[PDB]
Symmetry: C3
Subunit: 291 residues, 3 copies
């Protein structure tokens, strides 16, 4: 049994094995080892795109799926997450996928339960299958991480995914850049150099955009002028390297972080990421249940 | 890949093949051509009975099913319907069933996307599989549409299904009558002849009732006198033709559009329509995915 | 066709056959008799834990599953429960599991409908598959109910399951005791003898704990202090007989009705109950659909 909680808990070699298994699955490799086993999708915090992706993966592996969207009647009655998982084991669930509000909910969980937990997103915001599918997409494009320049743009401060991506990309030998409103930057980041979008589009092999939500303090950082000020405009995209790619974890705010016309332009790998997500999640599930 | 958006977009020949395929599936005919394929039921606007019927159809075809009930998190984050569908294609969904609040949401989509869209209901109220199962039920009863008299009753001008039925039944060789409050009539053609319920019950081979929504009711008195004034009372049903049938799309507002005692009477085919809905939806999915 | 409504409607022989069937299923007996058939889970009032258990049961029997969570669109459009079930029959559902807010909703339905209804909870609180899994767990431990002393603890007056359990245990030849705040006692109970927890722990073969909910309406009984004053403390548990067992339907309010350390202690069968729930539910489904 092998949980998946964070990228930092995986070895460079584990990452590469997962990417390789996903590529093989993407190529059509299939078996019946997991047919009839049970996966529970516990999306305490809803995320339809992520749940759908895991669900296709589970069903492509021949698994039965139990879905929970939003609050559980049990946790409403104060049930511990540990008891929830132990309940699932008792009824015959073999693997749990979890998206949950509590900060690092898994840390205590992982040593105490008897079935693998796959983190689909936590309170701190780690999202390891997103990182993995991102890595897979980059690797398919260039066949290496060494010496790549990867820029990541937007609310870096409040995207643990951005920061966990920067960290793992660094471990893999890539250089990382950040752009966005200065007030959304982590002032003390070991991984990545803060620069302007206008600089990054020219020096990058990979341009990774984040969704610009709407929340936090009074600073709404006008979504209206964001694209021009900070985002990937047509003019900025035109100055990208010939071989460079555009990535975005979705959903995309067209006209905000990116120009509506670029979402499906030739350098965009945005929908390819989504293709890859399923096979990554298949590989993560096989890893979870391998004996 | 064949979408299903509206009845008017189908030829009488296509309509007739769908009915025949449905009757064959209803007779027990099954195959494994769609086994393992994926359908997504995107019921942005909720309709439990319609979703259940499509879901039964998909599963009888051996398909994996992804369900979305109501609000999608992606959409809330501002995802376009086009992006939603493209996402579904990327994760490997083969056909999408959509019920959505936007008027003719499908019109733009069908030229843009690369998998079949099955319209389960749009903003304008087009509901083609409901029309097809109505047609199937009539066809099973009489074995032709040519020379039938079919009357449709209630809020005609605010029922896209009723007006689509009138038009398609006319194309098929039937004579259409309407009845209901004159203020709920849109007699700019609308393909049939406006009459009284009392007249139509005696001349009709088919009496099709519409749900009288509580919203189109002006008062609690308007609804309370409706049955006697406009609806299918016992006395009116007793004047029906020997071989005539009563139809209603459900759910039934008992005691309003029809007397409570008639819903499961000898001439009612209300529940048989629901049986037919599944086989119609199977035929429509097979049509969508035939190569 | 055999409905499951309440324990009082089963004979003691039917109860024993179900337990036997469940035990055989738990041992791995299986067949394809229900493969492809359709179960509808109509959880009008949510209970995630109960739905999950039924769903695993249904899926281990090879059945297709339709899930309804919370409000039904047609129900809110005023559809009677009878019409809903008749609708399900028409679309090809073979069995309905229902959890509904109305007192004895089943009583009218069962004389009217043509497919089996399995009550997963009504307005009164009758929950027969919970009683059955409790009985199974007890029977597995002692191979009999005759002469057993079973004690049940907490808010007896407001727990229909406790009272249903008391009555059926008595029918099966067992001796029932109650403990808890005297104000929560059903003084008019014919089936149980009221005693102190401190007495009950030493005389019981089975200690059944109830969840102590936060009521605060003449049930304001302080939750703090409850464990020491009324609950299963470590000290009380250590005075239980060597063969005796602890049971609880969950979710557990750790530190209230029971000490946190006792939930997974040697005498606890709390999680074993949850294992048994699936097989009991499989048994009840096979009974509904047999011959």
């Amino acid at each position: 049994m092998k949980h998946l909680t964070t990228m930092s808990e995986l070895s460079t070699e584990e990452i590469k094995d997962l990417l390789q298994t996903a590529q093989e699955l993407k190529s059509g490799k299939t078996d019946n080892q997991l047919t009839g086993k049970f996966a529970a999708n516990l999306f305490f915090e809803p995320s339809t795109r992520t749940r759908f992706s895991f669900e296709v993966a589970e069903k492509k592996l021949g698994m039965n799926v139990l879905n929970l969207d939003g609050t559980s009647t049990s946790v409403q009655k104060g049930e511990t997450l540990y008891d929830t998982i132990r309940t699932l084991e008792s009824i015959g669930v073999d693997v749990c996928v979890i998206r949950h509000s509590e900060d690092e909910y898994y840390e205590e969980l992982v040593s105490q339960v008897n079935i693998p937990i796959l983190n689909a997103g936590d309170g701190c915001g780690q999202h390891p299958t997103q990182s993995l599918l991102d890595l897979m997409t980059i690797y398919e494009e260039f066949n290496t991480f060494k010496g790549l320049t990867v820029s990541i743009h937007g609310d870096i401060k409040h995207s643990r995914v951005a920061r966990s991506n920067a960290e793992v990309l660094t471990r893999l030998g890539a250089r990382v850049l950040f752009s966005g409103p200065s007030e959304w930057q982590d002032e003390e980041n070991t991984f990545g150099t803060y620069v302007s979008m206008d600089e990054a589009v020219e020096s990058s092999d990979v341009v990774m955009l984040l969704r610009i939500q709407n929340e936090r303090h009074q600073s709404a950082v006008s979504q209206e002028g964001y694209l021009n000020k900070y985002g990937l405009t047509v003019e900025r995209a035109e100055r990208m390297k010939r071989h460079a790619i555009i990535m975005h974890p979705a959903p995309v705010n067209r006209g905000v972080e990116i120009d509506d016309s670029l979402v499906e332009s030739e350098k965009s790998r945005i929908f390819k990421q989504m293709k890859n997500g399923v096979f990554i999640r298949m590989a993560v599930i096989q890893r979870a249940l391998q004996t």
